[PDB]
Amino acid sequence: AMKSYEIALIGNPNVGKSTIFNALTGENVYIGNWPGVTVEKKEGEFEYNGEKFKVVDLPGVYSLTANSIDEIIARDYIINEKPDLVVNIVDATALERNLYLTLQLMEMGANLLLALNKMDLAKSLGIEIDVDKLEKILGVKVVPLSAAKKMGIEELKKAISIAVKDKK
Numbered sequence: 001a002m003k004s005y006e007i008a009l010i011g012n013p014n015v016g017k018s019t020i021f022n023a024l025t026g027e028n029v030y031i032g033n034w035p036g037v038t039v040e041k042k043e044g045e046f047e048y049n050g051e052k053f054k055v056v057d058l059p060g061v062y063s064l065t066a067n068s069i070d071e072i073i074a075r076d077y078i079i080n081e082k083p084d085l086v087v088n089i090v091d092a093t094a095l096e097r098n099l100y101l102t103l104q105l106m107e108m109g110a111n112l113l114l115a116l117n118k119m120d121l122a123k124s125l126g127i128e129i130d131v132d133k134l135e136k137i138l139g140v141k142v143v144p145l146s147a148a149k150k151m152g153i154e155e156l157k158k159a160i161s162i163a164v165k166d167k168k
Ligand SMILES: Nc1nc2c(ncn2[C@@H]2O[C@H](COP(=O)(O)OP(=O)(O)O)[C@@H](O)[C@H]2O)c(=O)[nH]1
Pocket: 012, 013, 014, 015, 016, 017, 018, 019, 020, 060, 117, 118, 119, 120, 121, 145, 146, 147, 148, 149
């Protein structure tokens, strides 16, 4: 009946991935781990419009090399599980370093959406981001938000429903 999609959340540690995951899924959540390791695996889902969205939280990583079991898990999933959409959660207060992962993600031909979190913190720290320039330079859609202050989440949901169609 209801059409489904699979989306993955990935970014550096401490960017608000857990906060965004909870905001998107609420009570619909299973918590376990990846096979044979003590790396936590969070999965949940939300309904938006008439469509259903399975959300997998990938391990927080700084790059997608193979220097850790986390990078391995994350890379294996992105490439071999082929999610309809990778939501790359990026911290606006440390853009440069967050974008290292982003570049690798683009390399892999991930269907990508950029969630530029912590806009409040950046503003309060005097950090300026030209979101439009960023969107332009990367050729990826950028959704500014502040998940901890419950701002932009709805915007994000909408952008997700739109971005998954870009896998076709
Ligand atoms: N200022 C601010 N803090 C945030 C935001 N989102 C998350 N945080 C805080 O950043 C810290 C780490 O967030 P968390 O979701 O646990 O990050 P994760 O490690 O990427 O999963 C927590 O203290 C959050 O409250 C935001 O939009 N603005």
